[PDB]
Design a binder for this molecule. Structure first.
Ligand SMILES: [Cl-]
Ligand SMILES: [Cl-]
Ligand SMILES: [Cl-]
Ligand SMILES: [Cl-]
Ligand SMILES: [Cl-]
Lengths: 124, 264
């Protein structure tokens, strides 16, 4: 675990939340970054090193947005219109397999963060 | 006519960029037109023109420090390097190789030939550490580049210089020589890890010359005498035929001409 995630927690259905993933030592700015979730683990979104190309899994298309700030060596997941089914542990990773982003976020994504719980519920 | 230059940077290195780098090195080392038992041979030194004798590997890191290694095409091994306006060569084993290296880095205003050779036995002694004690990976390579650079300004001592050579030679020369070693480097890059080479890597390195001879002198791929290698856990096993080495070895040193093939 070479990445440091932050920003999860409880959110009302229909609400928004923003996750952050920062790199203390790792040069994140050079690599494709992606977010994954597990309620089996599945890819959610990925973004090219330069930030000009992104891919999203079908179930989050139009609701989630991935972005990055290379000057801060950080990657973000903006989650809008959240649903109960979005409840899961979310984790960021960087891919060192490919020099460019691959369609459907193909890659080994061998460097990762610890992950954060995101819970979508009206409770509390 | 300049020697061919291949560039690699540790800054943002990926499995893909490293793969392209090693494939380019192999492509400049040999044409691949000479193949024995499905394994390519490096150029025969006999009659090899001086302007085709070397290739250059330019390495840089995030700090924008750069060094250039010179590799001998006849064995894929590092013979010297340049950093800024200084160049350093391992001790040549004979008069003809001493003459050959005078053709390298010819503009440098500071030119040095080390009294010592560049074989691992010597480098390990100078480093005060064995290959099995020295981590390999993108990080170690980045650090080796810096150390090679700072030697020219007195910022690096000999033991660290030797350690840095051990790192560069394995991640470039040995990786070029062995598909298997390239693969071990790929794994390190994939997970951004650094670790010393296991016994299988070290013994392959030690055996490269002997394997080249065994394969080229074989009777239809069958070895005259067995060669002992090591598994990843250190256990020893014997190889009796070229077959199992085909996925392992990428390049061989030229040992002899192949047996004459019949026209029938
Ligand atoms: Cl919303
Ligand atoms: Cl390259
Ligand atoms: Cl040796
Ligand atoms: Cl060793
Ligand atoms: Cl044993």
């Amino acid at each position: 675990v070479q990445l440091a995630e932050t920003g999860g927690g409880l959110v009302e259905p229909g609400g928004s939340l923003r996750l952050s993933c920062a790199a203390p030592e790792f040069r994140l700015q050079y690599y494709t970054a992606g977010w994954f979730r597990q309620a089996e683990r599945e890819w959610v979104a990925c973004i090219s090193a330069g930030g000009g190309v992104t891919y999203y899994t079908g179930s989050v298309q139009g609701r989630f947005t991935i972005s990055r700030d290379n000057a801060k060596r950080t990657v973000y997941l903006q989650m809008d219109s959240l649903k109960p089914e979005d409840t899961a542990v979310y984790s960021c990773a960087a891919d060192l397999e490919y020099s460019q982003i691959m369609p459907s976020c193909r890659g080994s994504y061998g460097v990762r963060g610890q992950g954060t719980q995101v819970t979508v519920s009206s409770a509390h | 006519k300049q020697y061919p230059i291949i560039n690699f940077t540790t800054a943002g290195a990926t499995v893909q960029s490293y793969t392209n780098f090693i494939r380019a090195v192999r492509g400049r080392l040999t044409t691949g037109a000479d193949v024995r038992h499905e394994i390519p041979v490096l150029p025969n030194r006999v009659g090899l023109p001086i302007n085709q004798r070397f290739i250059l590997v330019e390495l840089s890191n995030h700090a924008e420090l750069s060094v250039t290694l010179a590799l001998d095409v006849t064995n894929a091994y590092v013979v010297g390097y340049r950093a800024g306006n200084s160049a350093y060569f391992f001790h040549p084993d004979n008069q003809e190789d001493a003459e050959a290296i005078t053709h390298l880095f010819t503009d440098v205003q500071n030119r040095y030939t080390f009294a010592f050779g560049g074989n691992y036995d010597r480098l390990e002694q100078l480093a005060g550490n064995l290959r099995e004690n020295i981590e390999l990976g993108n990080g170690p390579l980045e650090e080796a580049i810096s150390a090679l650079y700072y030697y020219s300004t007195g910022g690096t001592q000999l033991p660290t210089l030797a350690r840095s050579f051990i790192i560069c030679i394995q991640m470039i020369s040995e990786a070029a020589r062995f598909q298997y070693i390239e693969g071990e480097m790929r794994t390190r890059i994939r997970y951004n890890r650094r670790s010393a080479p296991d016994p299988s890597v070290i013994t392959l390195e030690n055996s490269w010359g002997r394997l080249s001879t065994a394969i080229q002198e074989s009777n239809q791929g069958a070895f005259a005498s067995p060669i002992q290698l090591q598994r990843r856990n250190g256990s020893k096993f014997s190889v009796y035929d070229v077959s199992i080495l085909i996925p392992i070895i990428a390049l061989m040193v030229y040992r002899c001409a192949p047996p004459p093939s019949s026209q029938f």
